[PDB]
Design an enzyme around this catalytic site. Structure first.
Site, PDB file in Angstrom:
ATOM      1  N   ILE A   1       0.858  -1.178   0.000  1.00 27.37           N
ATOM      2  CA  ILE A   1       0.000   0.000   0.000  1.00 27.37           C
ATOM      3  C   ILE A   1       0.895   1.230   0.000  1.00 27.37           C
ATOM      4  O   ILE A   1       1.696   1.425   0.923  1.00 27.37           O
ATOM      5  CB  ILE A   1      -0.955   0.014   1.202  1.00 27.37           C
ATOM      6  CG1 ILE A   1      -1.743  -1.294   1.273  1.00 27.37           C
ATOM      7  CG2 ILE A   1      -1.900   1.203   1.111  1.00 27.37           C
ATOM      8  CD1 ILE A   1      -2.480  -1.482   2.577  1.00 27.37           C
ATOM      9  N   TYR A   2       0.764   2.054  -1.031  1.00 23.67           N
ATOM     10  CA  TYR A   2       1.529   3.284  -1.153  1.00 23.67           C
ATOM     11  C   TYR A   2       0.664   4.472  -0.761  1.00 23.67           C
ATOM     12  O   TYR A   2      -0.549   4.480  -0.979  1.00 23.67           O
ATOM     13  CB  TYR A   2       2.060   3.455  -2.578  1.00 23.67           C
ATOM     14  CG  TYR A   2       3.053   2.384  -2.959  1.00 23.67           C
ATOM     15  CD1 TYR A   2       2.626   1.170  -3.481  1.00 23.67           C
ATOM     16  CD2 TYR A   2       4.416   2.576  -2.777  1.00 23.67           C
ATOM     17  CE1 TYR A   2       3.530   0.181  -3.821  1.00 23.67           C
ATOM     18  CE2 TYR A   2       5.328   1.594  -3.116  1.00 23.67           C
ATOM     19  CZ  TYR A   2       4.879   0.398  -3.637  1.00 23.67           C
ATOM     20  OH  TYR A   2       5.781  -0.584  -3.974  1.00 23.67           O
ATOM     21  N   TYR A   3       1.313   5.451  -0.159  1.00 20.94           N
ATOM     22  CA  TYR A   3       0.602   6.633   0.364  1.00 20.94           C
ATOM     23  C   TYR A   3       1.135   7.933  -0.235  1.00 20.94           C
ATOM     24  O   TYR A   3       2.246   7.982  -0.709  1.00 20.94           O
ATOM     25  CB  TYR A   3       0.669   6.648   1.891  1.00 20.94           C
ATOM     26  CG  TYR A   3       0.008   5.471   2.551  1.00 20.94           C
ATOM     27  CD1 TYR A   3       0.679   4.279   2.721  1.00 20.94           C
ATOM     28  CD2 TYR A   3      -1.291   5.547   2.992  1.00 20.94           C
ATOM     29  CE1 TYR A   3       0.076   3.194   3.310  1.00 20.94           C
ATOM     30  CE2 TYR A   3      -1.906   4.469   3.585  1.00 20.94           C
ATOM     31  CZ  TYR A   3      -1.218   3.288   3.753  1.00 20.94           C
ATOM     32  OH  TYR A   3      -1.812   2.223   4.332  1.00 20.94           O
TER      33      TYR A   3
END
Lengths: 162, 162
Positions: A34-36
């Protein structure tokens, strides 16, 4: 140091059946990334924040411009919730099922990527780029693999896919 | 549910010597609390982000307005470094050495707070506010303690001290 191939044919299942007796099975890995983005665009400033869960092991990683800082985390969902409560927004998510096989000093990863398809990534532990290439050439020949070679990461391929 | 007292006299060492034979020693705790501010002031919006390390166990906690979300973390320094690389600034830090003793269903915490001094916090597991008060009254009487009662947290006392 690695060679990644998108597999057009045959299937990963078919390929796994051919190498199953002569290769040493290492393990299967279920992985989600999961990239933010902070509301300092990672796309503007070349930075990255990634929550990775691999077979239950959750790590949070900061990536600096072209540096990495990593901490192990007890729970992916709670860390994702904390990041969201602080203002960070979920950017891209990469879900992978990987099957690792071993032959000589080569690691063969059969990768099934959601939304992307089937890939094979081959790594040499202590081999020359030439030694790695010769193994990939014979592997692709021995199994009649129709491929498309890429150096892009799975996040880059996902971004390109979108 | 608890009663916190700043201890004027005698010393925590003196107090510990008096209750040592009749009380059951639980454990000693070394604890540091690091509070952060995003560059949405926590002081503006009543929120909080805290990195706590207690005897080696590191937890990150988000606090909502007047809600808590907590994740265990493998390393305090690396998590602090990740938070700083993301734009968060270290606000206040609270360092505590606590010694917990037990008598009946009461937990007595001898607290030594850096920059703040010596405190005693007494908790009742399942007692009435009246039952807790009677125990504190006798405890303070039995040991000739000169005190100052406060309901403020140690972060509030640190902020008040600054």
């Amino acid at each position: 140091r690695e060679i990644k191939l998108r597999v057009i044919s045959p299937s990963l299942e078919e390929i796994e059946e051919r190498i199953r007796n002569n290769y040493t099975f290492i393990n299967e890995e279920h992985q989600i990334d999961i990239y933010y983005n902070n509301p300092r665009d990672f796309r503007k400033s070349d930075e990255a924040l990634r929550l990775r869960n691999t077979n239950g092991k959750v790590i949070l990683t900061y990536k600096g411009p072209k540096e990495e800082i990593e901490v192990e985390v007890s729970d992916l969902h709670k860390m994702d919730l904390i990041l969201r409560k602080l203002g960070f927004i979920r950017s891209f998510q990469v879900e992978k099922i990987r099957k690792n096989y071993k032959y000589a000093d080569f690691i063969i990863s059969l990768d099934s990527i959601k939304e992307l398809g089937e890939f094979i990534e081959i790594e040499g532990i202590n081999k020359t780029e030439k030694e790695l290439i010769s193994f990939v050439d014979e592997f692709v020949k021995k199994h009649q693999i129709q491929y498309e070679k890429t150096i892009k990461s799975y996040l880059e391929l996902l971004v390109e896919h979108a």
